[PDB]
Amino acid sequence: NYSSLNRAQLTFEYLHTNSTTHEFLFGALAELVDNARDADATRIDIYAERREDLRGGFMLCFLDDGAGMDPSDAASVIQFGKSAKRTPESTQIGQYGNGLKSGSMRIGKDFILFTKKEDTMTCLFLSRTFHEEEGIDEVIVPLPTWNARTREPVTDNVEKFAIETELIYKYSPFRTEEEVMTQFMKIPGDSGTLVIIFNLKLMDNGEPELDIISNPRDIQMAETSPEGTKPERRSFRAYAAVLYIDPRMRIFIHGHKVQTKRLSCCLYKPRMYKYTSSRFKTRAEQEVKKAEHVARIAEEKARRREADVKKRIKEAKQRALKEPKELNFVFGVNIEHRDLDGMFIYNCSRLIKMYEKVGPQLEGGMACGGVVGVVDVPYLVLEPTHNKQDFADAKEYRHLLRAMGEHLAQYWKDIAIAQRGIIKFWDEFGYLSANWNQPPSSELRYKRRRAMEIPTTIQCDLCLKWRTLPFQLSSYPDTWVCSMNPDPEQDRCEASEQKQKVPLGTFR
Amino acid sequence: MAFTNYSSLNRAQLTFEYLHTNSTTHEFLFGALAELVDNARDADATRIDIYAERREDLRGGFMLCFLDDGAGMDPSDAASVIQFGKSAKRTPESTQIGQYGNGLKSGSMRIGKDFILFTKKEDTMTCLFLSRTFHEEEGIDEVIVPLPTWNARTREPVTDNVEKFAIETELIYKYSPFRTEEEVMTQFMKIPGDSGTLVIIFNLKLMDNGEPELDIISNPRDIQMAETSPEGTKPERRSFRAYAAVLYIDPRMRIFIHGHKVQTKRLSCCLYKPRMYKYTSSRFKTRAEQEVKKAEHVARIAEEKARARREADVKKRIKEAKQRALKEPKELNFVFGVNIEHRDLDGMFIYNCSRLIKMYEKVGPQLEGGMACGGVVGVVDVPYLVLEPTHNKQDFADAKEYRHLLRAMGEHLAQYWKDIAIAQRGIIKFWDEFGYLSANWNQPPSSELRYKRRRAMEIPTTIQCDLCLKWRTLPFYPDTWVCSMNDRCEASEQKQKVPLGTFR
Ligand SMILES: Nc1ncnc2c1ncn2[C@@H]1O[C@H](COP(=O)(O)OP(=O)(O)NP(=O)(O)O)[C@@H](O)[C@H]1O
Ligand SMILES: Nc1ncnc2c1ncn2[C@@H]1O[C@H](COP(=O)(O)OP(=O)(O)NP(=O)(O)O)[C@@H](O)[C@H]1O
Ligand SMILES: [Mg+2]
Ligand SMILES: [Mg+2]
Ligand SMILES: [Zn+2]
Ligand SMILES: [Zn+2]
């Protein structure tokens, strides 16, 4: 019985240390968005309340209507590392167990979660302010659990509950049970979570680190974005537009839906190369081996159903001797924006590396001058880093970049636009100037010419199904729905999903 | 703290799975090893031998060790090694490179599955076996860590709870690479003096094929990356020898990799005509004033609560030193100098508190395609006020001000390039006379005799001692060298005066 031996413990100072992993504040917000997606939410409203007695001047909130949490799972939010998302496929982007505790502490000094599922209402006040102003070097976290209907306390230790509520009212932005209950009433259904991040991080001058008073329908970097600055890295709107490859959720920033785009959909002539990534053909067999000797580890762990779960994964990995034997590289020229190009790397639909030049693009010149690329890497070929902006395997990451470079060269010599004349190709679609970053011309005819090539896609708002309209609106674009769809067949909401056919090219 | 008995409220806890999550921060294995090297430097050690054993029954085939003769640790301080976040290295002038409290626990788990510390200070012998293997083979989830504390003279147990001691020794003998007590004591004898650490990292990570991630059977005097040498790869990012050569800006310690001293170099002086530019970063005095506004203020906050007192006096001591930090920090020092021996190895070599954090960072005209500033190198020692390091200590966690500094360095690099007047009189002719006579910019220098001498005349040659660790400037053998070879060990320290160029 290892009951007396020393145990590794956390401390107050570790929270800032954990926060330092995020050198990209949009990256920090992406963790809280990922948690919402993993909760199966269909709305992640990011409205920013305005409380001027808190550092920064405003509060950043995060509503949702996923599954929420219950007492045990909520308590397991302060159980650093513990993540039950380790399971077959099941996108569930979180695997490590510190994305909330690393994103909420890079944004503001404190953070107060509100959640409610089934018949429970749970608050998870974690505030560094408490620790600073009362000397606690551990990480103490109140956790009251009111009941959904009667809104009466539900816990065993009444003095614990009283103390918990006392801190929650004397430190949090809300100073009484009435206000806290009002916050709970902002989750209308019987499932959701309202993560709030009060006192914020101040830039040196004094203004907050997130700007909401320049473009009110947007969250932009408080630093004056100096030229350059590929549009995702200066606006949370643009970043969240391509923060997923398979968007089945709606992101209303400041009560305004983000025009989600699926990159690969909106491109000039796409060509989907099914590379086995040669290595990954081996690490399809070693993935079969990995899932074999990790299902064997699962058998060793089980020696029940978890091994059976991983055995069917192993059989599914022996099906990945077919299915994840090849990653899918989707090359397509981007006529509307030419300099916004480079590999758009996705690990399980969680865009990790962006605008990365691989192959001839590294060498200066029009060679692959505009080609975009996308690949969805599962959680077997590569894994992410702690910040989930880099991959923690340099060798095989560079292997994939080299592979993508060769296939990008093949795509370039397949489209043959250089043979027909790269200058003519880029001139006929509008770019008629010197600088390579010069934005397009408008001149009606050119807008139309660009428009014919790219097809139109628009997500619904009752079934969250994409469609293939010849026109466009929405549902900061204006509303539209499936019933209003001008189309003979794709008219109803019960109609089957449609996917674009992807023409294919072959390597070698 | 209790006050109203905060004893029932839930507390954030760690778990077994978090160790891998923490390990993931390091995407650079040399970066992982740098944490264990930094701990030794903070311990005032004058030797950080990285000899690798040959235990072949462990995964990987060998064990990676780290001996040193710094200050070691004691029972309490060693126990505070598993107190994630706790770090008493945040002190005025901060000669310690650690502030977070996470280098060992994040580097030892990127290298190998487990890690066993041995240490001995004053009259103590403390082992800190922390092995993921134990957790895996017994289902333990909260990270349990044995910690025996033998006495360093009698070699007898010194602890209260004998059952705890027996259990601790049992796991230490049943899981660690060495069984019994005699072997453990032999490991303790490897630390000869009365201060040191012998951090050991057994079972390793096994790159996919089966060979370990670290290569030690290609160049036995080097720990190379177990992977090919692609044509474009800066030497620091392939060889720990080259990485450790320029890991510090103020090397006052000897790094014997595989029982072989690393010829430590200071990039600040091994260059063609150097120029130190005294930029105030415009911001920096404003920033420096700003933290001096805060640092003094936040010093009152900790002092105000202690004003119950050791902290308050130290915060006051910090505050006067931070009042003096209204005088000392006003200008960083940008040291530009061309690198004739290797020109493709160029770019800003950023240092934060004498640790290297960013490597070969092209800024300014170098970002523009062309020979403009084609070879110029740069260095700056950023204090712990202007910028801070990231989780992995390879990026700075302030993008706005990091890019501000890079822009500033770009302008000053342009100024230096126009000041050396090398492009003014035939940059082709400059690189011609100093050896480069081929097509590619990356093509290595000429090797004919006269050109080697020509390169040699410009750059002076420095050499560290081996008794006082005092650098010398032998005017105008290589593995062992002392002061009386030039002119003596008691002689005053010598520093190269740096020519100064002014901005604007
Ligand atoms: N909006 C939410 N709805 C439901 N459960 C949630 C929500 N946010 C967080 N959780 C739970 O809290 C846990 C902790 O979240 P987080 O700190 O993001 O770690 P993770 O998501 O488990 N893994 P990672 O994202 O890799 O750190 C999650 O795994 C969920 O179990
Ligand atoms: N070789 C050593 N000699 C003496 N003390 C050591 C040594 N290695 C580690 N320690 C102690 O263990 C603590 C934890 O080390 P580490 O996990 O590296 O965090 P840190 O060194 O405190 N700060 P950081 O360098 O930012 O990680 C140190 O701060 C020292 O107190
Ligand atoms: Mg998560
Ligand atoms: Mg450290
Ligand atoms: Zn619909
Ligand atoms: Zn000497």
Author numbering:
A (entry chain A): 5 to 307, 343 to 514, 519 to 551
B (entry chain B): 1 to 307, 309, 343 to 510, 519 to 528, 534 to 551
The publication says:
The Microrchidia (MORC) family of chromatin-remodelling ATPases is pivotal in forming higher-order chromatin structures that suppress transcription. All MORCs share three features: an N-terminal gyrase, heat shock protein 90, histidine kinase and MutL (GHKL) ATPase domain, a central CW-type zinc finger (CW) domain, and a divergent C-terminal domain (CTD) with predicted coiled coils (CCs). MORC2 possesses multiple DNA-binding sites that undergo structural rearrangement upon DNA binding. Importantly, MORC2 mediates chromatin remodelling via ATP hydrolysis-dependent DNA compaction in vitro, regulated by the phosphorylation state of its CTD.
We determined the structures of MORC2PD and MORC2 ATPase domain with (MORC2PD-DNA, MORC21-603-DNA) and without DNA (MORC2PD, MORC21-603), in presence of AMP-PNP, at overall resolutions of 1.9, 2.5, 2.4 and 3.2 Å, respectively, using cryoEM. Size exclusion chromatography multi-angle light scattering (SEC-MALS) analysis of full-length MORC2 (MORC2WT) reveals a homodimer of 264 kDa, which differs from the ATPase domain (1-603 amino acids, MORC21-603) that dimerises only when an ATP analog, AMP-PNP, is present. Upon overlaying these models, we observed no conformational changes within the ATPase domain. Overall, these structures show that the core of the ATPase domain does not undergo large conformational changes in the presence of DNA except CC1, and that MORC2 CTD is flexible. The punctae in full-length MORC2 constructs were absent in the CTD lacking MORC21-603 or absent in the N-terminal Domain lacking MORC2604-1032 constructs, showing that MORC2 CTD and NTD are indispensable for its DNA compaction function. Furthermore, we found that both the CTD and NTD of MORC2 are essential for DNA binding, as deletion mutants lacking either domain (MORC21-603 and MORC2604–1032) exhibited significantly reduced DNA binding at a MORC2 concentration of 10 nM.
